[PDB]
């Protein structure tokens, strides 16, 4: 059926509760040095490898986004995500999920 | 009509991708 | 407030619009 | 005086309907290769003559619009309204409607 | 955290407000 | 506690009825030359000297403001607001008060 906006409301805090316990999982077990999950208001981003891009596929259960895309952020080498270069936010690229850009 | 949740894509977009421009 | 609820909604449906290079 | 959004959005749907009704018109009696009629979620674009900028007057029903104004599009020689340079999203400048713009 | 509908009404205040060049 | 948006809505019509007053009061006590008290949805704006740049704190009756950095605007010579160069609405960067800048 034609998503209505209450309902994607409702599956985001599906998807921020489903991030809250992967993440609650991966601190009961740490090894190494990697970018940590995370929720972003979208998407829960998963382990990163340091030094590499990460891409998640464009969130499913968003209506309004191009699913077969992916979105893009940064881990740097310490294990942080990468703050966009001049600004004080993590450095995150939707540009393939919306068609506005 | 469904513009509600597409206009929500926007806010959830300029809250999400950070990128420059 | 609703002339700004009418002109946020010219805001969306502006982003949905022009889409010449800002 | 000033309009709401409900009244606002009862009135993009009246001028969203007789925009169908251009259409159905325009395609019972096609002639040429121009650019289609085509509604965008604000104006009804007209017939558009092949390899030329196509102006219209902001609309009048459009409040927030200044109506001393125009919104552009492109219609290439194939009859094909232009493509935004690098996306993939019809280009049109509505700049001359608005202040924030 | 409801705090985004107050927030993305930030945002169009943000857009009616800051004119400078981006 | 979490303000919500009727809230903040709340707290702005204050401070815009609060503005009106400050600016019916210096209208009864001009004197020079100076960029006048305006109201622009957010923050009013006090009496500019000519020919410097206005700084003003982050309003803290909005919750999502940086309440520790300061907006800004232009007063030319003439004592009046200065536009944006290229555009027709008045200059105000307020990048300081929001993170999305
Ligand atoms: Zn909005």
């Known amino acids: 059926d034609v998503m209505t906006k ?5 599956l985001l805090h599906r ?10 999982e991966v601190l009961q077990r740490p ?9 972003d208001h ?5 382990l990163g490898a340091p030094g590499e891009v990460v891409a998640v596929p464009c969130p499913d259960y968003i209506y309004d986004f ?28 939707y540009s393939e999920c919306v068609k506005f850009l | 009509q469904d513009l509600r949740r597409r206009f929500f894509x926007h806010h959830l977009x300029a809250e999400x991708h950070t990128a420059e421009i």
Chains 1, 4, 6 share one sequence.
């Open chain 1, 31 to 39: 090894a190494g040095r990697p970018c940590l999950p995370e929720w």
């Open chain 1, 42 to 46: 979208i998407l829960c981003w998963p």
């Open chain 1, 6 to 10: 209450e309902e994607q409301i409702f």
């Open chain 1, 15 to 24: 998807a921020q509760a489903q991030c809250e316990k992967r993440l609650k």
């Open chain 1, 66 to 93: 191009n699913h077969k895309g992916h979105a893009y952020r940064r881990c740097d080498r310490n294990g942080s995500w990468e703050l966009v270069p001049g600004h004080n936010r993590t450095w995150a690229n």
